Amino acid sequence: MMSRLKTAVYDYLNDVDITECTEMDLLCQLSNCCDFINETYAKNYDTLYDIMERDILSYNIVNIKNTLTFALRDASPSVKLATLTLLASVIKKLNKIQHTDAAMFSEVIDGIVAEEQQVIGFIQKKCKYNTTYYNVRS
């Protein structure tokens, strides 16, 4: 049995058809949040795919897992979500080699998903605020 936020994160990472998704309203707002981060952090993630390329193409799951866990030490909600969307991309790339579930990164996700009120709060308040601040400035 999974908490609300964890359920949504899985459905996001697993790219579930939003129809068999049990937490629609959050999944919905979660990926809108990630989408903006993906736009905004694009140069940063370009660096990250560069250093991770070997671990990804070599399918070194272990290696990827303690990278992300390291990056999560004492993470703020901003960071929790930045890391999440980073993991979304990796899972999409790993999916090219072998089928890879969100379940394989349960430990990392537990990290992303701690302080769930704080995190849900970000998805629903600040993330919205940021996205708008940004788009009103072109």
Coordinates of N, CA, C and O in Angstrom, one line a residue:
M1 N 0.9 -1.2 0.0 CA 0.0 0.0 0.0 C 0.9 1.2 0.0 O 1.8 1.4 0.8
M2 N 0.6 2.1 -0.9 CA 1.5 3.3 -1.1 C 0.8 4.6 -0.8 O -0.4 4.8 -1.1
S3 N 1.6 5.5 -0.2 CA 1.1 6.9 0.1 C 0.7 7.5 -1.2 O 1.1 7.1 -2.3
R4 N -0.1 8.6 -1.1 CA -0.6 9.3 -2.3 C 0.6 9.8 -3.2 O 0.6 9.4 -4.4
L5 N 1.5 10.5 -2.7 CA 2.6 11.0 -3.5 C 3.4 9.9 -4.1 O 3.9 10.1 -5.3
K6 N 3.7 8.8 -3.4 CA 4.5 7.8 -4.0 C 3.8 7.1 -5.1 O 4.4 6.9 -6.2
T7 N 2.5 6.9 -5.0 CA 1.7 6.4 -6.1 C 1.8 7.2 -7.3 O 2.0 6.7 -8.4
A8 N 1.7 8.5 -7.2 CA 1.7 9.4 -8.3 C 3.1 9.4 -8.9 O 3.2 9.4 -10.2
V9 N 4.1 9.4 -8.1 CA 5.5 9.4 -8.6 C 5.7 8.1 -9.5 O 6.2 8.2 -10.6
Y10 N 5.3 7.0 -9.0 CA 5.4 5.8 -9.8 C 4.7 5.9 -11.1 O 5.3 5.7 -12.2
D11 N 3.4 6.3 -11.1 CA 2.6 6.5 -12.3 C 3.3 7.4 -13.3 O 3.2 7.3 -14.5
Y12 N 4.0 8.5 -12.7 CA 4.7 9.4 -13.6 C 5.9 8.7 -14.2 O 6.1 8.7 -15.4
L13 N 6.8 8.2 -13.3 CA 8.0 7.5 -13.8 C 7.7 6.4 -14.8 O 8.4 6.2 -15.8
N14 N 6.7 5.6 -14.4 CA 6.3 4.5 -15.3 C 5.5 4.9 -16.5 O 5.1 4.1 -17.3
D15 N 5.4 6.3 -16.7 CA 4.6 6.8 -17.8 C 3.3 6.1 -18.0 O 3.1 5.6 -19.1
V16 N 2.5 6.0 -17.0 CA 1.2 5.3 -17.1 C 0.2 6.1 -17.9 O 0.2 7.4 -17.8
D17 N -0.6 5.5 -18.7 CA -1.8 6.1 -19.4 C -2.6 6.7 -18.3 O -3.2 6.0 -17.5
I18 N -2.6 8.0 -18.3 CA -3.5 8.7 -17.3 C -5.0 8.4 -17.6 O -5.7 9.1 -18.3
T19 N -5.4 7.3 -17.0 CA -6.7 6.7 -17.2 C -6.8 5.5 -16.2 O -7.8 5.2 -15.7
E20 N -5.6 4.8 -16.1 CA -5.5 3.8 -15.1 C -4.7 4.3 -13.9 O -4.1 3.5 -13.1
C21 N -4.7 5.6 -13.8 CA -4.0 6.3 -12.7 C -4.9 6.6 -11.6 O -5.9 7.3 -11.7
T22 N -4.5 6.1 -10.4 CA -5.4 6.3 -9.2 C -5.3 7.7 -8.5 O -6.1 8.1 -7.8
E23 N -4.2 8.5 -8.8 CA -4.1 9.8 -8.3 C -4.0 10.8 -9.4 O -2.9 11.4 -9.6
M24 N -5.0 11.0 -10.1 CA -5.0 11.9 -11.3 C -4.6 13.3 -11.0 O -3.6 13.8 -11.6
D25 N -5.3 14.0 -10.1 CA -5.1 15.4 -9.9 C -3.7 15.7 -9.5 O -3.2 16.8 -9.8
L26 N -3.0 14.8 -8.9 CA -1.6 15.0 -8.5 C -0.7 14.7 -9.6 O 0.2 15.5 -10.0
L27 N -0.8 13.5 -10.2 CA 0.0 13.1 -11.3 C 0.0 14.3 -12.3 O 1.0 14.7 -12.8
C28 N -1.2 14.8 -12.5 CA -1.4 15.8 -13.5 C -0.6 17.1 -13.1 O 0.2 17.6 -14.0
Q29 N -0.6 17.5 -11.9 CA 0.1 18.7 -11.5 C 1.6 18.4 -11.3 O 2.4 19.3 -11.3
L30 N 1.9 17.1 -11.0 CA 3.3 16.7 -10.8 C 4.1 16.8 -12.1 O 5.2 17.3 -12.1
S31 N 3.5 16.3 -13.2 CA 4.2 16.3 -14.5 C 4.3 17.7 -15.1 O 5.2 18.0 -15.9
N32 N 3.3 18.5 -14.8 CA 3.4 19.9 -15.2 C 4.6 20.6 -14.5 O 5.3 21.4 -15.1
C33 N 4.8 20.2 -13.3 CA 5.9 20.7 -12.5 C 7.2 20.3 -13.2 O 8.1 21.1 -13.5
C34 N 7.4 19.0 -13.3 CA 8.5 18.4 -13.9 C 8.8 19.0 -15.3 O 10.0 19.2 -15.7
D35 N 7.8 19.2 -16.1 CA 7.9 19.7 -17.5 C 8.6 21.0 -17.5 O 9.5 21.3 -18.3
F36 N 8.3 21.9 -16.5 CA 8.9 23.2 -16.4 C 10.3 23.1 -16.0 O 11.2 23.7 -16.5
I37 N 10.6 22.2 -15.0 CA 12.0 21.9 -14.6 C 12.8 21.4 -15.7 O 13.9 21.9 -15.9
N38 N 12.2 20.5 -16.5 CA 12.9 20.0 -17.7 C 13.3 21.1 -18.7 O 14.4 21.1 -19.3
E39 N 12.5 22.1 -18.9 CA 12.7 23.2 -19.7 C 13.9 24.0 -19.1 O 14.9 24.4 -19.7
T40 N 13.7 24.3 -17.8 CA 14.5 25.3 -17.1 C 15.9 24.8 -16.8 O 16.9 25.5 -16.8
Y41 N 16.0 23.5 -16.5 CA 17.3 22.9 -16.1 C 18.1 22.2 -17.2 O 19.0 21.5 -17.0
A42 N 17.7 22.5 -18.4 CA 18.1 21.8 -19.6 C 19.6 21.7 -19.8 O 20.1 20.6 -20.1
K43 N 20.3 22.8 -19.6 CA 21.8 22.8 -19.6 C 22.4 21.9 -18.5 O 23.3 21.2 -18.8
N44 N 21.8 22.0 -17.4 CA 22.2 21.2 -16.2 C 22.1 19.7 -16.5 O 23.0 19.0 -16.1
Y45 N 21.0 19.3 -17.1 CA 20.8 17.9 -17.3 C 21.6 17.4 -18.5 O 22.0 16.2 -18.5
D46 N 22.0 18.3 -19.4 CA 22.9 18.0 -20.5 C 24.3 17.6 -19.9 O 24.9 16.7 -20.4
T47 N 24.7 18.3 -18.9 CA 25.9 18.0 -18.2 C 25.8 16.6 -17.6 O 26.7 15.8 -17.6
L48 N 24.6 16.3 -17.0 CA 24.4 15.2 -16.2 C 24.3 13.9 -17.1 O 24.8 12.8 -16.6
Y49 N 23.7 14.0 -18.2 CA 23.7 12.9 -19.1 C 25.1 12.5 -19.7 O 25.4 11.4 -20.0
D50 N 25.9 13.6 -19.8 CA 27.3 13.4 -20.2 C 28.1 12.6 -19.3 O 28.9 11.7 -19.7
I51 N 28.0 12.8 -18.0 CA 28.8 12.1 -17.0 C 28.2 10.7 -16.7 O 28.8 9.8 -16.2
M52 N 26.9 10.6 -16.9 CA 26.1 9.4 -16.7 C 26.1 8.4 -17.8 O 25.7 7.3 -17.7
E53 N 26.5 8.9 -19.0 CA 26.3 8.1 -20.2 C 26.8 6.7 -20.1 O 26.1 5.7 -20.4
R54 N 28.0 6.5 -19.5 CA 28.6 5.2 -19.3 C 27.7 4.3 -18.4 O 27.3 3.2 -18.8
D55 N 27.3 4.9 -17.3 CA 26.4 4.1 -16.4 C 25.1 3.8 -17.0 O 24.5 2.7 -16.6
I56 N 24.6 4.6 -17.8 CA 23.3 4.4 -18.5 C 23.3 3.3 -19.5 O 22.6 2.4 -19.5
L57 N 24.3 3.5 -20.5 CA 24.4 2.6 -21.6 C 24.9 1.2 -21.2 O 24.6 0.2 -21.8
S58 N 25.6 1.2 -20.1 CA 26.1 0.0 -19.5 C 25.1 -0.6 -18.6 O 25.3 -1.7 -18.1
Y59 N 24.0 0.1 -18.4 CA 22.9 -0.4 -17.6 C 23.4 -0.7 -16.2 O 23.0 -1.7 -15.6
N60 N 24.3 0.2 -15.6 CA 24.8 0.0 -14.3 C 23.8 0.6 -13.3 O 24.1 1.6 -12.6
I61 N 22.7 -0.1 -13.1 CA 21.7 0.4 -12.2 C 22.2 0.8 -10.8 O 22.0 1.9 -10.3
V62 N 23.0 -0.1 -10.2 CA 23.7 0.1 -8.9 C 24.3 1.5 -9.0 O 24.0 2.4 -8.1
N63 N 25.2 1.7 -10.0 CA 25.9 3.0 -10.1 C 25.0 4.2 -10.1 O 25.2 5.2 -9.4
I64 N 23.9 4.2 -10.9 CA 23.0 5.3 -11.0 C 22.3 5.5 -9.7 O 22.1 6.7 -9.3
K65 N 21.9 4.4 -9.0 CA 21.2 4.5 -7.7 C 21.9 5.3 -6.6 O 21.3 6.1 -5.9
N66 N 23.2 5.0 -6.4 CA 23.9 5.8 -5.4 C 24.5 7.1 -5.9 O 24.9 8.0 -5.0
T67 N 24.4 7.4 -7.2 CA 24.6 8.7 -7.6 C 23.4 9.6 -7.1 O 23.6 10.5 -6.4
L68 N 22.2 9.2 -7.5 CA 21.0 9.9 -7.2 C 20.8 10.1 -5.7 O 20.4 11.2 -5.2
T69 N 21.0 9.0 -4.9 CA 20.9 9.0 -3.5 C 21.9 10.0 -2.9 O 21.5 10.7 -1.9
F70 N 23.1 10.1 -3.5 CA 24.0 11.1 -3.0 C 23.5 12.5 -3.3 O 23.5 13.3 -2.4
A71 N 23.0 12.7 -4.5 CA 22.4 14.0 -4.8 C 21.2 14.4 -4.0 O 20.8 15.5 -4.0
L72 N 20.7 13.5 -3.2 CA 19.5 13.7 -2.4 C 19.8 14.0 -0.9 O 18.8 14.3 -0.2
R73 N 21.0 13.9 -0.5 CA 21.4 14.2 0.9 C 20.8 15.5 1.2 O 21.2 16.5 0.6
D74 N 19.9 15.6 2.2 CA 19.4 16.8 2.7 C 18.7 17.7 1.7 O 18.7 18.9 1.8
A75 N 18.0 17.1 0.8 CA 17.4 17.8 -0.3 C 16.1 18.6 0.1 O 15.3 18.1 0.8
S76 N 16.1 19.8 -0.4 CA 14.8 20.6 -0.3 C 13.8 20.1 -1.4 O 14.2 19.4 -2.3
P77 N 12.5 20.4 -1.2 CA 11.5 20.0 -2.2 C 12.0 20.4 -3.6 O 11.8 19.5 -4.5
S78 N 12.5 21.6 -3.9 CA 13.0 22.0 -5.2 C 13.9 20.9 -5.7 O 13.7 20.4 -6.9
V79 N 14.9 20.5 -4.9 CA 15.9 19.5 -5.3 C 15.3 18.1 -5.4 O 15.6 17.4 -6.4
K80 N 14.4 17.7 -4.5 CA 13.7 16.5 -4.6 C 13.1 16.3 -6.0 O 13.2 15.3 -6.7
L81 N 12.4 17.4 -6.4 CA 11.7 17.4 -7.7 C 12.6 17.5 -8.9 O 12.4 16.8 -9.9
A82 N 13.7 18.3 -8.7 CA 14.7 18.3 -9.8 C 15.3 17.0 -10.0 O 15.5 16.5 -11.2
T83 N 15.6 16.3 -8.9 CA 16.2 14.9 -9.0 C 15.1 14.0 -9.6 O 15.5 13.1 -10.4
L84 N 13.9 14.1 -9.2 CA 12.9 13.2 -9.8 C 12.8 13.4 -11.3 O 13.0 12.3 -12.0
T85 N 12.7 14.6 -11.8 CA 12.6 14.7 -13.2 C 13.8 14.2 -13.9 O 13.8 13.7 -15.0
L86 N 15.0 14.4 -13.3 CA 16.2 13.8 -13.8 C 16.1 12.3 -13.9 O 16.5 11.7 -14.9
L87 N 15.5 11.6 -12.9 CA 15.2 10.2 -12.9 C 14.2 9.8 -14.0 O 14.3 8.7 -14.5
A88 N 13.3 10.7 -14.3 CA 12.3 10.4 -15.3 C 13.1 10.1 -16.6 O 12.8 9.1 -17.3
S89 N 14.0 11.0 -16.9 CA 14.8 11.0 -18.2 C 15.6 9.7 -18.2 O 15.7 9.0 -19.3
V90 N 16.3 9.4 -17.1 CA 17.2 8.2 -17.1 C 16.4 7.0 -17.3 O 16.8 6.1 -18.1
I91 N 15.2 6.9 -16.6 CA 14.3 5.7 -16.8 C 13.9 5.5 -18.3 O 13.7 4.4 -18.7
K92 N 13.7 6.7 -19.0 CA 13.4 6.6 -20.4 C 14.5 6.1 -21.2 O 14.3 5.5 -22.2
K93 N 15.7 6.5 -20.8 CA 16.9 6.1 -21.6 C 17.3 4.6 -21.2 O 17.6 3.9 -22.1
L94 N 17.2 4.2 -20.0 CA 17.4 2.8 -19.6 C 16.4 1.9 -20.2 O 16.7 0.8 -20.6
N95 N 15.2 2.4 -20.5 CA 14.1 1.7 -21.1 C 14.5 1.3 -22.6 O 13.8 0.4 -23.1
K96 N 15.5 2.0 -23.1 CA 15.9 1.7 -24.5 C 16.7 0.3 -24.5 O 16.7 -0.4 -25.5
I97 N 17.4 0.1 -23.4 CA 18.3 -1.1 -23.3 C 17.5 -2.3 -22.8 O 17.4 -3.4 -23.5
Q98 N 16.8 -2.2 -21.7 CA 16.0 -3.2 -21.0 C 14.7 -2.5 -20.5 O 14.7 -1.3 -20.3
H99 N 13.6 -3.3 -20.3 CA 12.5 -2.7 -19.6 C 12.8 -2.4 -18.2 O 13.2 -3.3 -17.4
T100 N 12.7 -1.1 -17.8 CA 13.0 -0.8 -16.4 C 11.8 0.0 -15.7 O 11.4 1.0 -16.2
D101 N 11.4 -0.6 -14.6 CA 10.3 -0.1 -13.8 C 10.7 1.0 -12.9 O 11.9 1.2 -12.7
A102 N 9.8 1.8 -12.3 CA 10.1 2.7 -11.2 C 10.5 1.9 -10.0 O 11.1 2.4 -9.1
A103 N 10.0 0.7 -9.9 CA 10.2 -0.2 -8.7 C 11.7 -0.4 -8.5 O 12.1 -0.7 -7.3
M104 N 12.5 -0.3 -9.5 CA 13.9 -0.6 -9.4 C 14.6 0.5 -8.7 O 15.8 0.3 -8.2
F105 N 13.9 1.6 -8.5 CA 14.5 2.8 -7.9 C 13.7 3.2 -6.6 O 13.6 4.3 -6.3
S106 N 13.1 2.1 -6.0 CA 12.3 2.3 -4.8 C 13.0 3.1 -3.8 O 12.4 4.1 -3.2
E107 N 14.3 2.8 -3.5 CA 15.1 3.5 -2.5 C 15.2 5.0 -2.8 O 15.0 5.8 -1.9
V108 N 15.6 5.3 -4.0 CA 15.8 6.6 -4.5 C 14.4 7.4 -4.3 O 14.4 8.5 -3.8
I109 N 13.4 6.7 -4.8 CA 12.1 7.4 -4.8 C 11.6 7.6 -3.3 O 11.1 8.7 -3.0
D110 N 11.9 6.7 -2.4 CA 11.6 7.0 -1.0 C 12.3 8.2 -0.5 O 11.8 9.0 0.3
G111 N 13.5 8.5 -1.1 CA 14.2 9.8 -0.8 C 13.4 11.0 -1.3 O 13.2 11.9 -0.6
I112 N 13.0 10.9 -2.6 CA 12.3 11.9 -3.3 C 11.0 12.3 -2.6 O 10.5 13.4 -2.7
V113 N 10.5 11.3 -1.9 CA 9.1 11.3 -1.5 C 8.9 11.5 0.0 O 7.8 11.6 0.5
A114 N 10.0 11.6 0.7 CA 10.0 12.0 2.1 C 9.4 13.4 2.3 O 9.5 14.2 1.4
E115 N 9.0 13.7 3.5 CA 8.4 15.0 3.8 C 7.3 15.3 2.8 O 7.4 16.3 2.1
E116 N 6.3 14.4 2.7 CA 5.4 14.4 1.6 C 4.5 15.6 1.5 O 4.1 16.1 0.5
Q117 N 4.1 16.2 2.7 CA 3.3 17.4 2.7 C 4.2 18.6 2.1 O 3.7 19.4 1.3
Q118 N 5.4 18.7 2.6 CA 6.3 19.7 2.0 C 6.5 19.5 0.5 O 6.4 20.5 -0.2
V119 N 6.6 18.3 0.1 CA 6.8 18.0 -1.4 C 5.5 18.3 -2.2 O 5.6 19.0 -3.1
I120 N 4.4 17.7 -1.7 CA 3.1 18.0 -2.4 C 2.9 19.5 -2.4 O 2.4 20.0 -3.4
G121 N 3.2 20.2 -1.3 CA 3.1 21.6 -1.3 C 3.8 22.4 -2.4 O 3.3 23.3 -3.0
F122 N 5.0 21.9 -2.7 CA 5.8 22.5 -3.7 C 5.1 22.3 -5.1 O 4.9 23.2 -5.8
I123 N 4.8 21.0 -5.4 CA 4.1 20.7 -6.6 C 2.9 21.6 -6.9 O 2.7 22.0 -8.0
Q124 N 2.2 21.9 -5.8 CA 0.9 22.6 -6.0 C 1.0 24.2 -5.8 O 0.2 24.9 -6.3
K125 N 2.0 24.6 -5.1 CA 2.2 26.1 -4.8 C 3.4 26.6 -5.5 O 3.3 27.2 -6.6
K126 N 4.6 26.5 -5.0 CA 5.7 27.2 -5.5 C 6.0 26.8 -7.0 O 6.2 27.7 -7.8
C127 N 6.0 25.6 -7.3 CA 6.2 25.2 -8.7 C 5.3 25.9 -9.7 O 5.8 26.4 -10.7
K128 N 4.0 26.0 -9.4 CA 3.1 26.8 -10.1 C 3.6 28.3 -10.2 O 3.6 28.9 -11.3
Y129 N 4.0 28.8 -9.1 CA 4.4 30.2 -9.0 C 5.7 30.5 -9.8 O 5.7 31.4 -10.6
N130 N 6.6 29.6 -9.7 CA 7.8 29.6 -10.5 C 7.5 29.6 -12.0 O 7.9 30.5 -12.8
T131 N 6.8 28.6 -12.5 CA 6.4 28.5 -13.9 C 5.8 29.7 -14.4 O 6.0 30.1 -15.6
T132 N 5.0 30.4 -13.6 CA 4.2 31.6 -14.1 C 5.2 32.8 -14.1 O 5.2 33.5 -15.0
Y133 N 6.0 32.9 -13.0 CA 7.0 33.9 -12.9 C 7.8 33.9 -14.2 O 8.0 34.9 -14.9
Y134 N 8.2 32.7 -14.6 CA 9.0 32.5 -15.8 C 8.3 32.9 -17.1 O 8.8 33.7 -17.9
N135 N 7.1 32.3 -17.3 CA 6.4 32.5 -18.6 C 5.9 33.9 -18.8 O 5.6 34.3 -20.0
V136 N 5.7 34.7 -17.8 CA 5.3 36.1 -17.9 C 6.5 36.9 -18.3 O 6.4 38.1 -18.7
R137 N 7.7 36.4 -18.2 CA 8.9 37.0 -18.6 C 9.5 36.6 -19.9 O 10.6 36.7 -20.3
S138 N 8.6 36.0 -20.7 CA 8.9 35.2 -22.0 C 9.7 34.0 -21.6 O 10.5 33.4 -22.3

